[PDB]
């Protein structure tokens, strides 16, 4: 490059930022996803489709692990997702080289959102088009956080993103209670993902990852075929 | 026609109202019977999609210029009733021509008629056609940005 | 909009052929009328705190 | 579209009234063209002929262009 | 140069352009009246009426030569009293980048310059003064250039 | 609509889209070429025609079938100048896998490294996003054959049989009708379908001089470009 | 002197829409293409209450529309339309009618009266040549 | 025949008696009179070349409803309205309107 | 409470306002953008007042050709002064009353004469009495500001 470095995101005359609001529009028209925190573990459930019978499902993965106990899904766009995965992978290593201890889940999200915000103020680039759902069972209590293209973190009990997320939002508002078990959380997570799905819900149309206090665990399609018997 | 849009210099508001009248009257609440409509243009790129939607304009059809045998057939049509001797190399006329237009091959049949009336000839020779194309070939190539981009 | 909620809660009880109304009838009635372009999303209004 | 003469009482059509129009093209009618000798033009005599071949012979030889099988431009 | 909807010349021109075009060939044959229409610019036109059917006899106007301009100046000088010792080689050599309007304009000025001093004749000196009076000696020393 | 400079540089639209990248998807179609990839049970076929407009032009320096490593080949569509720039990147990062890690690079991991680079060109706004496609083949240990496709947006996935180029929606529609009927796939069963799909979509029924076949096999993992004679041998064999 | 005439029509409309008489036992129905364009004083409840959207017909409605058109059509005995139901590239309702007409106009043309399940494929390929796919990017 | 006097028809009143003399069907508006009366070309599908695929397809949808609707009975399906002649210029698109007229 | 004691209080007890030394108000503007209490509050005060109520929408005075739409302006107020216990109601003064534009370009000066007449009748000649006007429209940024002093 040359030395331009001019930020292409400035304030509106109203006083809002324009490109971040447009980046949120790309997230809302993405694949639906749901995450539920249920007092012994946290369950991530995304919704994976294939436009043909020609694609392969053992290749592209949505639920992606980070350390040994920290999972991560998204709802926005695809190529930008893999960037900040590899960024967060290295970002958890400088914690572990220095402190010799697995990084707490709150400590990642402070660092990932700091990457993402500082990315928007600098010049020549667009913001990301990805929102995240990060979870983990650190120090007894499990956790569930959500980031955004603006770079703001939250702490949900149960949220949803992607298409028709407000419909899934009201559904969890009646479905979720003070506490459940892990298996009940999986049963209501498939229930809310079956809200806006299509007719074929096989072991390949959904893709589910959990966080035990024993650790992160990604579910193979065998159990998801077995657990979808009398689903929702 | 054209596309609807936002705040648009109030002259344009009328033409959208004229267009909305046309969309309603030819296909709306009433039943248009024994009536057929032939629309013809060159820029079908940006219109109202409510105008191009089927039911009112069912089958659109594209009409292409080059076939290399059509330009042979267009040439035989326009040079049908012309006095000559049959010494007409149509293939070299077809090969050397960038006419691309039945009006242009009408113009080529006009030009070779103009050279033939020069030097007092009732018949038309093949060289008149070779002068007819080169006048056509020069007249077109003295132009720039001659775009031909539809939908 | 108070009238619209009263009409929608009335219309929901009509199709059930019922002269009674619940609290939930109004909850789905307000959610019908509250249909705006400034969508909720939790991220439009929390990034600006 | 004709401007016929009408009786004021019987309303009968009896006249033709040669039907003028707007004054703007009336202002565009320029007659009495002065004869300019072609030799006033220098160096452009080929274009003069190609014009005279294009227009004047269609004006004169109306039937030479009809029996040949062509149409004047 | 059509398909361009940009303010303000996007609406008022294209119909009058079209109502021209659909009048020229159009639907019914118009073999009653001839059109000899002329421009001074080619490429700005869109290829809509620009093809054959309509205006197809492209008559380029070349730049007038030294021999063309010297011929033209001799024509406009014919109506006045001119001394016969006028070299057209010098005139064609000194006249550069003129047209028929500008070759006429020098010939009017060189006669009026001769009207000022009261002679009844002309020389090459009059026309050189007539040439210099056209542009009125365009020379600004931009002074950057050595 | 268009806000700011969303038609020009890689920023967002008010509709939550962008436009430069989806212009680049139909920057392939100015190439005027169609390539088909089919994976069988123990092979992986790449087939691609070539157009030779001039007799004064070689029949050697034309074919898009390139060789990344000794066990990985590819095919390029789109424009040609952007294609060979893409290939030198793939040749370069395959060798760095050897020098850093020691073993041969998998065909899956290479498509990540390519799609990351295409991401960045989308990402920073002051550079062009390189419109050309990418299809790889290769044999993995304890995984069999693979077929992948990088895109100028920056995403990839595995496939079973997937074409690219100009004609996909007729070519992929035929391959779906071929796969879902659950037939056998051995070697020549896989090669014959890779011809007849490209035969029926293009509707040519050609002479064995335009297409090139780049099969890789489990028994012979070397990337191999077929001879014109044996290309003619398969074509008359499927002919009844 | 034209935007004032449109504006006074709106004010005249809303007065006798809802003024001092609230004219009983009449109903007003409107049907435009874009509703984010018109006046926000029109969309208020108590003046217009039913904000009915007509979206594009999805799957499970194509089977409804195909059933109703071909209830009147004398088509083939053993053609199935189900391959052309799960298709992408969303299709408006009037397109289905055009496909059915374009099939029949092709069915007449070779002096026939019934369907051989090839004219439907031509009509489907005919009507679809437009701009297309979601590009499998940003999901 | 007062049953024909439909509320919205047009009549001719007497000048003095003012009563109805003769009813008149419609108006013409001599503006659009000029868009009716003109000759196309007396052309006969023979002043056109290389287009018989497009021509026969176009004639199929126009001629058949205005001539023989019994084929459309035997199918049942209603015929559609019309076509669009889009094309880059000079291809001969106004020449077809001569032919059908 | 503001409207009741700006309308019924000048009527029922005018001697109070004639005792301080200042004059009684006659001009009321109501505005609310979504239409909240813009007719109900009008029809209620039209109900329990025992006073004459005149409602004229600001869209009727337009009349086809010239002058006729202007002459009935003064013909209204002389009827309004004919019954001194009366209130004129205006409905949606937004079109007639926008802005005095140019005359050769758009902004046709035909309804402008009525706005000139309306402003110069109530206070152009004599300050009348027992006449209360009520104007109800939203959009208080687009109508004219001379009647807003
Ligand atoms: N394919 C063709 N075959 C025979 N004659 C043709 C053909 N195309 C054009 N012509 C000639 O063109 C003239 C008709 O004009 P034409 O329809 O070509 O203009 P156009 O295509 O309508 O132009 P535009 O598209 O700009 O309106 C006729 O005189 C005819 O002789
Ligand atoms: N305080 C209230 N109590 C009961 N209903 C109300 C109240 N405020 C508003 N409404 C309802 O709102 C609707 C609008 O009436 P309102 O007079 O408030 O505005 P409006 O005159 O219709 O607006 P506009 O002047 O734009 O026409 C009425 O149907 C009314 O029932």
Curated annotation (Swiss-Prot), chain A:
GO BP term, pick one: response to virus
Q: Where in the cell is it found?
A: Cytoplasm; Nucleus
| SMART domains for this protein | Proteasome_A_N
Asked if the Swiss-Prot or TrEMBL record annotates the protein with the keyword Phosphoprotein, the reply is yes
Q: What conditions trigger expression of this protein?
A: Down-regulated by antioxidants BO-653 and probucol. Down-regulated in response to enterovirus 71 (EV71) infection (at protein level).
Q: Which PANTHER family match?
A: PROTEASOME SUBUNIT ALPHA/BETA (PTHR11599)
Task: Briefly state the protein's biological role.
Answer: Component of the 20S core proteasome complex involved in the proteolytic degradation of most intracellular proteins. This complex plays numerous essential roles within the cell by associating with different regulatory particles. Associated with two 19S regulatory particles, forms the 26S proteasome and thus participates in the ATP-dependent degradation of ubiquitinated proteins.
Q: What is this protein called?
A: Proteasome subunit alpha type-2
> What is the organism field in this record?
Homo sapiens
From Swiss-Prot, chain D:
- PTM text: Sumoylated by UBE2I in response to MEKK1-mediated stimuli.
Q: Where in the cell is it found?
A: Cytoplasm; Nucleus
Which branch of life, at top level? Eukaryota
Q: Which residues cross the membrane?
A: none
Q: What does this protein do?
A: Component of the 26S proteasome, a multiprotein complex involved in the ATP-dependent degradation of ubiquitinated proteins. This complex plays a key role in the maintenance of protein homeostasis by removing misfolded or damaged proteins, which could impair cellular functions, and by removing proteins whose functions are no longer required. Therefore, the proteasome participates in numerous cellular processes, including cell cycle progression, apoptosis, or DNA damage repair.
Q: What family does this chain come from, according to its entry?
A: Belongs to the AAA ATPase family.
Clinical condition linked: Deafness, cataract, impaired intellectual development, and polyneuropathy: An autosomal recessive disease characterized by early onset of deafness, cataract, severe developmental delay, and severely impaired intellectual development. Patients later develop polyneuropathy of the lower extremities, associated with depigmentation of the hair in that area.
What is the name of this protein? 26S proteasome regulatory subunit 6A
Q: Which organism is it from?
A: Homo sapiens
| Classification of source organism | Eukaryota, Metazoa, Chordata, Craniata, Vertebrata
First and last residue shown, out of the full length, are: 148 to 220 of 439
Swiss-Prot record, chain G:
- The coiled-coil segments of this chain are none
**Sites bearing N6-acetyllysine, chain numbering:** 118, 122
Instruction: Give the UniProt subcellular location, in the record's own words.
Output: Cytoplasm; Nucleus
Functional note: Component of the 26S proteasome, a multiprotein complex involved in the ATP-dependent degradation of ubiquitinated proteins. This complex plays a key role in the maintenance of protein homeostasis by removing misfolded or damaged proteins, which could impair cellular functions, and by removing proteins whose functions are no longer required. Therefore, the proteasome participates in numerous cellular processes, including cell cycle progression, apoptosis, or DNA damage repair.
In which family does this protein belong, per the annotation? Belongs to the AAA ATPase family.
Partners and quaternary state?
Component of the 19S proteasome regulatory particle complex. The 26S proteasome consists of a 20S core particle (CP) and two 19S regulatory subunits (RP). The regulatory particle is made of a lid composed of 9 subunits, a base containing 6 ATPases including PSMC4 and few additional components. Interacts with NR1I3. Interacts with PAAF1. Interacts with TRIM5. Interacts with ZFAND1.
Can you say what this protein is called?
Answer: 26S proteasome regulatory subunit 6B
Gene encoding the protein: PSMC4
UniProtKB/Swiss-Prot annotation, chain I:
In this chain, ATP is annotated as bound at 32-39
Cellular compartments annotated: Cytoplasm; Nucleus
Question: Where are the N6-acetyllysine modifications?
Answer: 64
Q: Got any disulfides in this one, which pairs?
A: none
Purpose of the protein: Component of the 26S proteasome, a multiprotein complex involved in the ATP-dependent degradation of ubiquitinated proteins. This complex plays a key role in the maintenance of protein homeostasis by removing misfolded or damaged proteins, which could impair cellular functions, and by removing proteins whose functions are no longer required. Therefore, the proteasome participates in numerous cellular processes, including cell cycle progression, apoptosis, or DNA damage repair.
Family assignment? Belongs to the AAA ATPase family.
Q: How does it assemble?
A: Component of the 19S proteasome regulatory particle complex. The 26S proteasome consists of a 20S core particle (CP) and two 19S regulatory subunits (RP). The regulatory particle is made of a lid composed of 9 subunits, a base containing 6 ATPases including PSMC5 and few additional components. Component of a complex with USP49 and RUVBL1. Interacts with PRPF19. Interacts with TRIM5. Interacts with NDC80. Interacts with PAAF1. Interacts, in vitro, with the thyroid hormone receptor (in a thyroid hormone T3-dependent manner) and with retinoid X receptor (RXR). Interacts with ERCC6.
Q: What is this protein called?
A: 26S proteasome regulatory subunit 8
What is the source species? Homo sapiens (Human)
Complete protein: which residues are present? 159 to 307 of 406
